[PDB]
Design a protein around this ligand. Structure first.
Ligand SMILES: CCc1c(C(=O)NCc2cccc(Cl)c2)[nH]c(C)c1C(C)=O
Length: 116
């Protein structure tokens, strides 16, 4: 199988992560792990079993925790699916998530074509 070097993945994928961070107001609720106590939603971890957020994805990209590009895509989509699962369709986080997913699909496509 094609082996991806850590810096290869970082150079290719970090710009797609930065594109999500650039989204204001939509990325703000995703820039840090959900804190259910601070946010007053103690049921969060009862519903979301595998939390994910932009800062965790960034740390994983910085520490070589992705061996394949699709593992990175999986974490971004885990973040999205958590927000779509937990939040009501009318909520800001839900609609912001939908916007981030539109941005991400546009950014990741040419990058996947460039990668192996
Ligand atoms: C609703 C809770 C939530 C947040 C969040 O950050 N809230 C505070 C906030 C600050 C600024 C702007 C907004 Cl819209 C919300 N973040 C997540 C991923 C979620 C969930 C549960 O999924």
């Amino acid at each position: 199988k094609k082996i991806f070097k850590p810096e290869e993945l970082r150079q290719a994928l970090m710009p797609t992560l930065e594109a999500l961070y650039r989204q204001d107001p939509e990325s703000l609720p995703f820039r840090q792990p959900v804190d259910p106590q601070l946010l007053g939603i103690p049921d969060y971890f009862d519903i979301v079993k595998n939390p994910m957020d932009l800062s965790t994805i960034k740390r994983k990209l910085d520490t070589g925790q992705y061996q394949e590009p699709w593992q990175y895509v999986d974490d971004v989509w885990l973040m999205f699916n958590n927000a779509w699962l937990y939040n009501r369709k009318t909520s800001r986080v839900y609609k912001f998530c939908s916007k981030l997913a539109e941005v991400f699909e546009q950014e990741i496509d040419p990058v996947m074509q460039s990668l192996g």
